[PDB]
Amino acid sequence: FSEEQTAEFKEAFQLFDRTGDGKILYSQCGDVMRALGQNPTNAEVMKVLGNPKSDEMNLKTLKFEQFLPMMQTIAKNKDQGCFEDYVEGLRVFDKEGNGTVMGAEIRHVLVTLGEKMTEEEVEQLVAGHEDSNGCINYEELVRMVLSG
Amino acid sequence: MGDDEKKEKKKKSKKKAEEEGGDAPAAPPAPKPPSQKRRAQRSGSNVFAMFTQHQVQEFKEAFQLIDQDKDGFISKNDIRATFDSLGRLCTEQELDSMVAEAPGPINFTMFLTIFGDRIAGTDEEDVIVNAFNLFDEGDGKCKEETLKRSLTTWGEKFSQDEVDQALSEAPIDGNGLIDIKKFAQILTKGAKEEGA
């Protein structure tokens, strides 16, 4: 990364502290990273954190040359998707095959699959991209997730 | 030169901050290099525009019982008078801490930036309120015992003397010190009693 954007990252680190000495909680790693032009899966991060459970996930600490290498060690990346991948991967609620997507079910997948979203996380991604019957045009729901 | 602007502001800046490191002694305070006027600009600072119609004239709405220089002022010689007669204070040690909101003419065109400096001067809300509102989590507050654990065990460790005085004083309000208000006792919207 250039020193420029890394300075912005130095701040996005610096802000997020606890005892006042260059110390970020493991928890915050992916989220800060996400804002920093990245969407690293919890599974991706968990690899480069060393499999904590909720306890030491909440308790263990990062510092900057643990954070910034992690950022990088995901950032140069492998599979990360595009429109064509995500129209199929968001035709993912087509109910008959309809070019529009299932309202409750888009919420449920988000609770029910891998990286279990809260209710909160589910509703926010979905809401108001359905119609009266609760059909979501995914062809657009795709671009919404893929840019913003 | 422009040191003329700065003699009028060795009068008025000095309004911030040259003797400020008082009982905690002789700090690296406000600098003479002109760019640094904008480090004196820290958060908590609102200054309303010149022909204000009035948030600035509200200072006329109290003007009478404050001023010094009445073609219409409060000079050095008026927080190095008035605060000893209006809001707080100063030892030669804390001299131009508080007197660093006037070491030189608070004209009406500076009353402007003294209720400006009221909602500004000493580390105001974004600093003070948020000192603990950032340790805090949310629509919340901080735990009493944990704040005792702080004050003594975290950083420059303080004495018993210091804790006891700041204990009987601490607004313990439901097992938790009401931090936002321990700071913003000094602020909101319902009093016209002190400082000014």
Binding site: R34, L146 | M98
Partner: protein, 146 residues
């Protein structure tokens, strides 16, 4: 439209019949022939199978549907990070404060702006004036389409 990417390898080429592509995603995590059942719309499962393969489908969709949920988390965290982006030097300011606490409730510019501050008009107002004109038009437009 869920199991999809258990076989990221099997399905490509844009779009693909529903029903059929499901056999492609389902085979790619073993999902034994006798245990899942296809109608028009409903899928049916035996004791034991559905659900440990739904669970293990969380384990094997990973690849894109975890990388779907990831994009979501991304998009959201952008907006939602907040809570610790702060305290550091202000905590150290609590210490500035505390070394001086003896002299804190003891403060200069406290309350003298605000009791005669219901009685007055002209308020924030110059900040308002320009942006009030902008506010006036906007407020009209938004009410209209509701």
């Amino acid at each position: 439209q869920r199991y999809e990417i258990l076989a990221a390898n099997a399905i490509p080429k844009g779009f693909m019949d529903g029903k059929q592509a499901c056999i492609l995603m389902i085979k790619a995590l073993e999902l034994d022939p006798n245990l899942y059942r296809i109608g028009q719309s409903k899928i049916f499962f035996r004791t034991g199978v559905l659900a440990h393969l739904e669970e293990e489908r969380d384990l094997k969709i990973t690849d894109v549907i975890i990388a779907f949920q990831a994009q979501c988390r991304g998009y959201l965290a952008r907006k939602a990070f907040a809570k610790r982006q702060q305290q550091l030097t202000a905590m150290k300011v609590i210490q500035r404060n505390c070394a001086a606490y003896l002299k804190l409730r003891n403060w200069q510019w406290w309350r003298l702006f605000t009791k005669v501050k219901p009685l007055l008009q002209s308020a924030e107002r110059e900040k308002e004036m320009a942006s009030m004109k902008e506010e006036f038009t906007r407020l009209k437009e938004a009410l209209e389409k509701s």
